[PDB]
């Protein structure tokens, strides 16, 4: 367990890098820190590790306050992008720096075969490059059985398909040792599967802390909504209008009827509507059931992937991206009848940019 | 335009590698040859290129028979795994070769080489040598020696095999953009299936030497002619179970295990009562509550065992009775291992094959 109570970090010149970071990681938890560059996500990790000092706040590991504890005295394994293995040491010895009980150390180190480095086991760092030397750094930390793991983009020099293989082995390791993990990555796509809870940070402030599913389906503001999930969620200005007992959203000359179950102090007001691509669907089941919420749009580019078909269109004056089932019939220039799934509409304040529900 | 009329190739020992290969490529067309290893796809290219002889049949590039024409007199551009760039020549000279001894247009060779370089954004590499380049750049350079040929056909034998995951996709879309630019016939051979759905005008699926099907990407995907095309194109693989067709009233139902799926009015005779193989793709086993209300008749309970969230999709792996099935649904599903899920089978997208003959009934 690690707790950060009201933690600040200020840079030279008074600039605030991390602003009131409060969060309680329970033990045996996988927490992911995502956010744009300079959002303070990397800074907090260096502070939990003890590489930067904590200007203000408290940091506890278990029960012990460690703000002024040297990194070596925290029982933490760290992998950062300065992994920097020693050039004139074998792969084994470069992973065997756990001070120790030799001849069992080897067993655990050979078990690092999970990283597919067993065929490099007696090599030296210069013969590997890019991805392989980063998997060596991982290995070093992998055999440490610490109280918490701290990882800063440890799979960034690897290629797609091998990064995926090592992400599943990190998750299995957390499932096996059940020690706290704090994982930092630029990629968002690796947050949604790995972490128990995800923390979205922006310009030093944490926007939201929730489970991957909850971040995806209940964002707190337009930023989190437009930061998690790709391609970016579609955004339009819309006016809420009550017609009869129905509640409608109007943007351009188009008309979306919200389902009975939505709402008070925003009726007649103009809001921003948010729908994700996979909720603009063209299969005709939806075009008959959600007939009230079908809109005609002029397709401009289509992209077929085998997993999906992404359709980029323009409705009245606004560009929209849609995700439909693989191998679609749409082509650039035609106008297609898309249905907006009102049950998946997000509504934010135009000024505060936070959600109304 | 390229035509291959009844073309065969047999190996030492009498084994036939290519068996009655027939198809007429229209000019300015992108054709893809896909199939398992040793399906003869590489052999066919080697025969179009002139590197192997044609045992029987007729090859016509343009309007002329070229079975006995040397490759170099065939007006062919080739990017194969043979095309090692010349080690001690600049990429420029490596792109100006062939053109340099096909009746040198010295001035008109610089102009064309640099237009092919500007298309591939390799002009800032014109003075580097192949050993200084990396795999991806030399695959762009190798392509470049072919744009300067202005050929009648381009021949590509797995030219994106030496690349890593992301790079591949980047140079495929560049080829699709490239064919859309030169508007010359392309014949492309690749191992990966995913570009059935991405690259080609028409696709040829080959199996054990035979052409299984020649069709457009959508039609290849949506109307496979046999279980092989059905299970070779599309990922994850299409689900297959043995089922028996049964006529109850004028409805027609399909039964496998304890479950019963009713086909819509429009599916007919001379296969009813017999055991068939059913084929449905994962994106047609789907759990959205829209499906369970319209297609309540064809809702099935299945025990989830593994789920994989990808951001683009959610893959759900389930067992029904003794049978296994996979479904592809929206990115963040709530189904988790141990639960039982209520999936709807989209009857309008079920494929039915002969159990013995293994070819499609419709």
Residue numbers in the entry:
A (entry chain B): 3 to 101, 107 to 270, 276 to 369
B (entry chain A): 3 to 269, 275 to 369
Task: Copy out sentences from the published article reporting this entry, exactly as the authors wrote them.
Clostridium thermocellum has extensive potential in lignocellulose biorefineries as an environmentally prominent, thermophilic, cellulolytic bacterium.
Considering the importance of transporter B as the major cellodextrin transporter, we further identified its cryptic, hitherto unknown ATPase-encoding gene as clo1313_2554, which is located outside the transporter B gene cluster. We therefore suspected that Clo1313_2554 represents the ATPase subunit of transporter B. Therefore, we deleted clo1313_2554 using homologous recombination and obtained the Δ2554 mutant. Therefore, the same phenotypes of the Δ2554 and ΔtransporterB mutants imply that Clo1313_2554 is the missing ATPase subunit of transporter B, which is the sole cellodextrin transporter in C. thermocellum. To better confirm the function of Clo1313_2554, the crystal structure of Clo1313_2554 was determined at 2.8 Å resolution. Clo1313_2554 presents the general α/β-type ATPase domain fold in homodimer form, similar to that of other NBD crystal structures. The ATP-binding Walker A motif from subunit A and the ABC signature motif from subunit B were approximately 30 Å apart in the structure, indicating that the nucleotide-free homodimer was in an open conformation. The crystal structure of the ATPase was solved, showing that it represents a typical nucleotide-binding domain of the ATP-binding cassette (ABC) transporter.
